Design a binder for this molecule. Structure first.
Ligand SMILES: CC(=O)[C@@H](O)[C@H](CO)N[C@@H](Cc1ccc(O)cc1)C(=O)O
Length: 309
């Protein structure tokens, strides 16, 4: 039949994605059955675009703001690790074109303002970080990548200002009760490990140790509640889009987690790390670990960009 050509194209795309999959690493996991499951979830969503001879569109909520802990990152502004990551995502769409002529697009849905309050990061800085990321997309020629922000939705408040109000509106319309978020979080080991990870990152950036513990635990549920709301919003806007994610994700999930630079931490993202050249390969690592390595900082455009070891 005529499906063999279509089924060939979709499977080449899925196989390329699988090369970059972000997942909880555990050697007791059968990887072969995991991939078999992912095939059953994503191949239909992929073929929807191929049948209609439409470019494959991907959603990725990512790059909200730079982490404020200087022990983790180099500067408030986006750095090489962000640049490498954008360059990678764009070139990922570019090669789909050789297999498929329409090619693909990735909408980066920057979640910066949605949880800005809970990160204790100025909306002014988040807006600045977003602006620079659009500027990096032009610097690099990332013609397949585009940006979606809370400001963009017509339904949520018109104004960029009163982001607080935008946050309130998003939570009322698209959020879920924190108790539901916590209850759901505590069924899976998927949800368990998300909760742990998000608390850890919130703790680290915040350095009265107990008040600091219980607070990170409470803010974590908050930040997850906001981010799932954001996803709900995206889930309505771009329903047939393939859902990329910056977090590990179970194989049955609709979301597909993805890496953008080499790293040994499944939870690391370039806005929580720096770029290190070791043995001719750039890697994503926390700022402090590189300093222990003794690698020397390299500054481009004046602002520090990366560390070379
Ligand atoms: C479920 C989530 O919403 C998070 O996982 C989130 C996704 O965007 N990434 C971060 C959160 C974070 C980001 C910027 C910052 O300055 C501080 C914290 C994380 O993993 O901890």
């Amino acid at each position: 039949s005529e499906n063999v050509s279509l089924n060939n194209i979709s499977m080449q795309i899925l196989r390329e994605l699988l090369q970059y999959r972000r997942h909880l690493t555990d050697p007791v996991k059968n990887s072969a059955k995991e991939e078999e499951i992912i095939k059953t979830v994503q191949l239909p969503r992929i073929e929807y675009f191929i049948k209609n001879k439409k470019p494959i569109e991907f959603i990725l909520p990512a790059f909200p703001t730079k982490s404020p802990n200087i022990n983790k990152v180099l500067g408030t502004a986006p750095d090489m690790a962000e640049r490498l990551s954008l360059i990678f995502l764009n070139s990922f769409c570019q090669r789909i074109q050789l297999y498929y002529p329409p090619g693909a697009r990735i909408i980066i849905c920057s979640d910066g303002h949605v949880f800005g309050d809970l990160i204790h990061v100025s909306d002014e800085v988040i807006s600045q970080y977003h602006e620079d990321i659009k500027q990096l997309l032009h610097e690099v020629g990332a013609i397949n990548l585009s940006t979606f922000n809370l400001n963009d939705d017509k339904e949520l408040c018109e104004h960029s200002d009163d982001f607080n109000l935008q946050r309130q509106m998003l939570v009322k319309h698209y959020a879920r009760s924190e108790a539901s978020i916590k209850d759901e979080l505590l069924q899976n080991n998927n949800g368990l490990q998300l909760y742990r990870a998000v608390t850890r990152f919130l703790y680290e950036d915040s350095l009265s140790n107990n008040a600091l513990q219980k607070d990170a635990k409470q803010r974590a549920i908050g930040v997850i509640q906001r981010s799932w709301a954001w996803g709900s919003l995206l889930d309505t806007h771009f329903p047939k889009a393939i859902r990329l994610s910056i977090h590990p994700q179970p194989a049955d999930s609709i979301k597909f987690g993805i890496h953008m630079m080499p790293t040994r931490d499944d939870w690391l993202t370039p806005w929580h790390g720096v770029a290190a050249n070791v043995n001719g390969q750039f890697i994503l690592m926390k700022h402090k670990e590189v300093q222990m390595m003794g690698g020397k900082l390299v500054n481009i455009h004046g602002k520090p960009s990366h560390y070379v070891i």
